[PDB]
């Protein structure tokens, strides 16, 4: 890592800007390189801006009665703040003596023998310093703004960070991630690049009153009369500013709701293919942007007018002011353009400098009041009592859920009631109970996530918590097992040796450190809860909660496990345990068997008993016909005003002219006629409510059109190029990327086009009617085409590589809400608050170089201009004649134009930085694709088939065959990582596979894919529960009636779920169905199988956490719902194996094939030794 150039670098480089350039040469003539990006300047690292404002908001929060983030903020910015505004002031306040200077400079071609003959070339010297002095004070101050609206982002996205990570366990349900992710990506570049536009609140009526007096020096009266114009102006544009924040606070509702659910169905998209939710998920997506492309467009045509106030109040501006004047003294047209000079500068103060200043004071101060808000919110409070005896002690204890009912404590039962235990330290309690008991809850009560109403708990602060749902964040399986801690050799291989993924981790290629993703979907279901299970043990802690790891293992592992972990690894202290099964009961001491939210037995085992660049500007302009359509139908009226504009001055030059209405003569008429259409051209060459109108509302119609390609295509692209993206890089796109195609670009564009037509048309008319002029433009034109090309190859590179530096941002915010309750039960915050502020540096040092590299354009482009204007005004002064100057009447009229371009150069390039947004949707939209009556009897017949994940990797399955009969039940077993999901995923051919699967004397490669995955019906390992209501979950499509869904509800057993909740069958899941049970969550997904009626239909252990109980509700559905067709049962509990017939057992990347059971256990007898003696009776007579 190279350090910042900024960090050595003398007065006159940090005021030129000459410490970037090495990355342009670099950048010109190679591709970026990792090397050549600068480590971050000290000043604006995270943890200095975390500490500093962390530090007064605490002081803040101390003194004050009702306290402010602003005030937080104005303690440590803004005196930098106000320093570089007077500078932003001088150098706002010399554009308005410009007129004065450089209106005596043109004056003088007069052959009227004038005194400005004498002033010139003093005017001449005081001219060139003038502008000298602005160029260098301007862009300093900007940079100096950007820097501190960086450090402001930088400073505020740190205390949200840590704020999320000490939040409410109540609050949760409330804010879902979408709300996190849009607060982020709404200020991640608007923030920043805010406060150089910020000052002009206070610099626009100051310039406006330095103005007002110099034009009143021309024109007595009528000045005040064209102001009244501007005023009644600026209401309007502020009517449209207030109108147009009233539509963006409706749609921004809408857009969290969009990317909760875009990024649950990516998140686990391997279940939306299963059960064929593409028609389904583009159908819901879709509707929740009809609302929100409504209010954008809406928002879109106000925003219109308030850009298009500018060039339309040129015209009208000048004419009510000198028409006045005209009617009773008569006006020279020296005067009148002077006055013209003047206005441009006024309006620029007052209808686009005055306008964007405000604006930007409601939605910084918006953002930092949600901010605020978000700060002040309820915290997850903790009370740990170091000092004990050890004794994990609970007494009386009952809780609630949700606020309301525990507040007003019938509204309602509560999850726990009447619970007391006492436990000494070097004993397990075995935690037993049916789904929905509260054994995950009794567990929240321990760790204090959940807050009882009348009750008390004490053990001492440390702890360890093994989650129901298993948790993987990004990075190693050392770095998940031992979780920001040293490394202990000793500790370490003890720990794998004792929960055993020696098996498993020495299958891997790289042995012990491979990078899995946001979840670990690399590994199976049993490789993550025995990684949770390793990172629970590896910790060290008074008190190990365990909720119920031996789900997804085998009988052999969790025999192994449970007598080489549990009982022999920590056997000296007190660890609450979930399980049901009576092998682990008799082992274990204190027993507590809830029941509904209450104790149905507590003690032990034995008193039981007793008890009972160009493609990318090409294909976003050809996606959508009426774009192409528009823009020649701008083009062809742009020609017409350019036509009739030309004829006008062709009559006015022409002229052979009492008449004190206008004054001219043959001196003066030749060189102020040409300046005044000039002036007046910004006008004339506008584009009306019939031109800007539909341009806004085709370019919003293309972000419409390109975001359901985008959303399309991510559904059906295959397994490994979506295993292969992030989280975070997949919402950053859907958050941020198609926003800014809606919001920004197409009114960016339309800036771009607006001032193109203004110089194109203006170089036209002046060129047609005075031929030298376009000569005289070429070498400056030529000038900022050349430096633009040079400046846009290193600058398309930093763009990129800050807008995919957004990735580690979102990434790291998923992971860290979504195992939250882990990060606390280890209390691991530290951890992840550094690993935070990485992601936050990675961001800076990009967003820092791409926005330094900027003003050395914005500095160099007014400088090329500087040394072309300081050349023309010599040669013009000196070279004027005796009488009548041609040489500057010819040159300066050039070199008006090109003030208007300067600013166009500046608008192009900030559509380019809006156009790699697209480029990189189009990434996207260009992934490649996965690709009587059928399914009678349901008789596969597999032959010579493989299974593999990556291309040309390890083969899973190798050369598999066999065949099932119709109407028969089959079996599938092995050992955990054995292969079997594989197997499941190999019918649907999810991974790309060879051989052929024929089915009822028919194969693969005689239908289509999607025809042929309607054929089988799936329950998968991981459940998927989108939020929406029941009805949405259990059938997308609606096809079935309330009557069917009711009709399936039963024989499940959803009847008392459901009823349970206030809106039956439509209450709206929040969170990915936390209020849900896990139980519940099984017998959703089989209620989802059991509508989609199928002749073949495969389960991936439908039974995970059931208990013997709940069981029998999934053979009672499985022998009566599913008569005639077959099954593929993917289960671990041997009570399943009574059911099939046929087992196919998976080892060694093969298969075995056998008919009866004694048989297959006959040959294994470790497996056969692990069957427990109540499934022993069974399956032996
Ligand atoms: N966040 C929540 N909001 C509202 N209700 C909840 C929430 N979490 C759990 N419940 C309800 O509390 C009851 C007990 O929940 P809990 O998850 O502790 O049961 P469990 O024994 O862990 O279930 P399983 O045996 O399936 O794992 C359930 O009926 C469930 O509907
Ligand atoms: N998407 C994937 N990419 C790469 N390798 C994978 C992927 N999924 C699984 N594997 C590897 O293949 C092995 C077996 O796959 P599979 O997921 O079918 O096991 P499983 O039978 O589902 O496990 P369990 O018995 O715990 O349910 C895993 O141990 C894992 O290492
Ligand atoms: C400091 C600011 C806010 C003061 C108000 C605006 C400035 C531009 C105003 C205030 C006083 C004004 C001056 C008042 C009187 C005269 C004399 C007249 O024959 C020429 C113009 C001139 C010289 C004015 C120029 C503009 C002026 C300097
Ligand atoms: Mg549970
Ligand atoms: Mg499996």
């Known amino acids: 890592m190279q350090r910042s150039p900024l960090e050595k670098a003398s007065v006159v480089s940090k005021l030129f800007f000459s410490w970037t350039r090495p990355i342009l040469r670099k950048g010109y003539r190679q591709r970026l390189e990792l090397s050549d990006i600068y480590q971050i300047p000290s000043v604006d690292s995270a943890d200095n801006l975390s500490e500093k404002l962390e530090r007064e908001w605490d002081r803040e929060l101390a003194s004050k009665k009702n306290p402010k983030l602003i005030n937080a903020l104005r303690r440590c910015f803004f005196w930098r703040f106000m320093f570089y505004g007077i500078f932003l002031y001088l150098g706002e306040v010399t554009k308005a003596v410009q007129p004065l200077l450089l209106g005596r400079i043109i004056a003088s071609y007069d052959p009227d023998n004038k005194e400005e003959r004498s002033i010139a070339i003093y005017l001449g010297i005081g001219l060139c310093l003038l502008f000298i002095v602005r160029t260098l004070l301007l862009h300093p101050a900007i940079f100096g703004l950007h820097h501190i609206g960086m450090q402001m982002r930088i400073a505020m996205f740190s205390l949200i960070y840590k704020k999320t990570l000490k939040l409410s366990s109540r609050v949760l349900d409330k804010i879902s991630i979408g709300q996190l992710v849009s607060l982020l990506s709404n200020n991640l570049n608007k923030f920043d690049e805010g406060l150089a536009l910020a000052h002009f609140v206070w610099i626009a009526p100051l310039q406006v009153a330095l103005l007002m007096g110099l034009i009143w020096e021309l024109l007595q009266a009528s000045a005040f009369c064209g102001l009244g114009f501007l005023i009644v102006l600026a209401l309007f544009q502020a009517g449209l500013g207030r109108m147009m924040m009233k539509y963006r606070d409706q749609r921004a509702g809408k857009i969290s709701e969009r990317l909760v659910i875009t990024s649950e169905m990516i998140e686990n998209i391997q279940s939306v293919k299963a059960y064929c939710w593409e028609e389904a998920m583009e159908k819901m997506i879709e509707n929740l942007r009809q609302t929100e492309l409504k209010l954008t467009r809406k928002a879109a045509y106000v925003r219109y007018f308030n850009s298009s106030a500018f060039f339309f109040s040129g015209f009208f501006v000048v004419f009510l002011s000198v028409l006045p004047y005209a009617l009773i003294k008569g006006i020279i047209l020296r005067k009148i353009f002077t006055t013209i000079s003047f206005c441009i500068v006024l309006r620029m103060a007052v209808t686009r400098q005055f306008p964007w200043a405000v ?670 209501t029941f009805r949405k979950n259990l059938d997308p499509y609606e096809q079935w009636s309330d009557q069917e869904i009711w009709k399936v509800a039963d024989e499940v057993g959803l009847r008392s779920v459901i009823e349970q909740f206030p809106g039956k069958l439509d209450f709206v899941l929040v969170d990915g169905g936390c209020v849900l049970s896990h139980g519940h969550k099984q017998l959703m997904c089989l209620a989802r199988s059991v509508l989609s009626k199928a002749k073949i239909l495969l389960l991936d252990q439908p039974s995970a956490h059931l208990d013997p109980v709940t069981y029998q509700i999934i053979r009672r559905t499985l022998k009566q719902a599913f008569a005639d067709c077959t099954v593929i049962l993917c289960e671990h509990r041997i009570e399943a194996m009574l059911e099939c017939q046929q087992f196919l057992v998976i080892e060694e990347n093969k298969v075995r094939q056998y008919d009866s059971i004694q048989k297959l256990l006959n040959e294994r007898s470790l497996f056969r030794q692990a069957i427990s003696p109540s499934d022993r009776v069974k399956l032996f007579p």
């Open 359 to 1028: 604006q930007t004071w409601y939605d910084s101060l918006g953002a930092i009041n949600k901010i605020q808000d978000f700060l002040q919110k309820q915290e997850y409070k903790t009370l740990e009592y170091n000092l004990t005896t050890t004794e994990v002690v609970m007494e009386n204890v009952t809780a609630f859920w949700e606020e309301g009912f525990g507040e007003l404590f019938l509204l309602g039962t509560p999850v726990l009631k009447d619970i007391n235990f006492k436990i000494e330290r070097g004993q397990l309690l075995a935690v037993a109970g049916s789904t929905g008991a509260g054994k995950t809850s009794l567990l929240m009560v321990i760790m204090g996530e959940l807050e009882p109403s009348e009750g008390k708990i004490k053990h001492s602060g440390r702890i360890s918590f093994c989650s129901q749902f298993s948790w993987i964040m990004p990075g190693t399986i050392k770095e998940n097992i031992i979780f920001g801690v040293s490394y202990d050799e000793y500790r370490y291989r003890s720990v794998i040796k004792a929960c055993q993924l020696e098996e498993d981790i020495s299958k891997f290629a790289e042995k012990d450190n491979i990078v899995l993703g946001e979840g670990g979907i690399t590994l199976s279901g049993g490789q993550r809860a025995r990684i949770s299970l390793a990172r629970a043990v590896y910790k060290d802690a008074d008190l190990y909660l365990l909720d119920s790891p031996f789900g997804y293992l085998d009988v052999l592992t969790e025999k192994e496990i449970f007598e080489s972990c549990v009982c022999k690894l920590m056997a000296n202290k007190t660890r609450i345990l979930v399980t049901s099964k009576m092998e682990h009961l008799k082992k274990a001491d204190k027993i507590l068997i809830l029941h509904e939210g209450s104790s149905y037995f507590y003690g032990t085992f034995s008193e039981l008993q007793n008890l009972q660049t160009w493609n990318t500007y090409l294909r976003y302009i050809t996606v959508h016909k009426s774009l192409i359509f528009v823009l020649i139908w701008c083009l062809v009226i742009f020609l017409a005003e350019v036509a009739a504009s030309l004829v006008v001055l062709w009559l006015l030059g022409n002229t052979p002219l009492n008449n004190s209405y206008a004054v001219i003569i043959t001196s003066t008429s030749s060189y102020y006629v040409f300046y005044i259409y000039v002036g007046v051209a910004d006008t004339l060459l506008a584009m009306g409510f019939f031109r800007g109108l539909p341009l806004v509302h085709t370019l919003i119609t293309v972000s419409k059109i390109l975001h359901h390609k985008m959303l399309h295509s991510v559904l059906q692209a295959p397994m490994s190029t979506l295993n292969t993206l992030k989280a975070g890089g997949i919402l950053n796109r859907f958050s941020k990327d198609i926003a800014i195609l809606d919001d920004l670009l197409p009114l960016t564009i339309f800036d771009f086009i607006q001032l193109l037509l203004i110089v194109i048309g203006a170089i036209a008319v002046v060129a047609v009617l005075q031929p030298y002029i376009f000569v005289a433009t070429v070498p400056v034109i030529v000038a900022f085409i050349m430096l633009r090309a040079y400046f846009l190859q290193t600058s398309q590179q930093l763009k990129q590589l800050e807008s995919e530096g957004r990735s580690p941002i979102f990434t790291h915010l998923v992971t860290s809400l979504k195992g939250l309750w882990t990060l606390r039960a280890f209390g691991r915050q530290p951890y992840f608050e550094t690993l935070f502020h990485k992601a936050l540096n990675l961001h800076t040092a990009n967003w820092f170089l791409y926005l330094s590299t900027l003003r050395w354009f914005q500095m160099r482009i007014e400088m090329i201009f500087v040394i072309f204007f300081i050349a023309v005004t010599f040669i013009s002064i000196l070279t004027t004649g005796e009488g009548e100057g041609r040489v500057g009447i010819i040159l300066t009229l050039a070199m008006n134009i090109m003030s208007t371009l300067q600013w166009a150069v500046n608008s192009s390039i900030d559509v380019d930085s809006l156009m790699r947004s697209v480029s990189r949707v189009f990434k996207f939209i260009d992934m490649p694709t996965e690709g009587d009556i059928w399914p009678s009897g349901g008789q596969m017949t597999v032959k010579d088939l493989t299974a593999k994940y990556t291309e040309g990797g390890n083969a899973i399955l190798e050369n598999i065959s066999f065949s099932i009969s119709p109407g028969q039940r089959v079996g599938l077993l092995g050992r955990t990582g054995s292969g079997k999901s594989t197997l499941l995923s190999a019918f649907l051919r999810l991974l790309n596979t060879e051989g052929e699967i024929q089915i009822d004397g028919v194969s693969w490669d005689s239908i289509t894919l999607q025809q042929w995955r309607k054929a089988f019906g799936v329950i998968p390992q991981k459940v998927f529960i989108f939020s929406g």
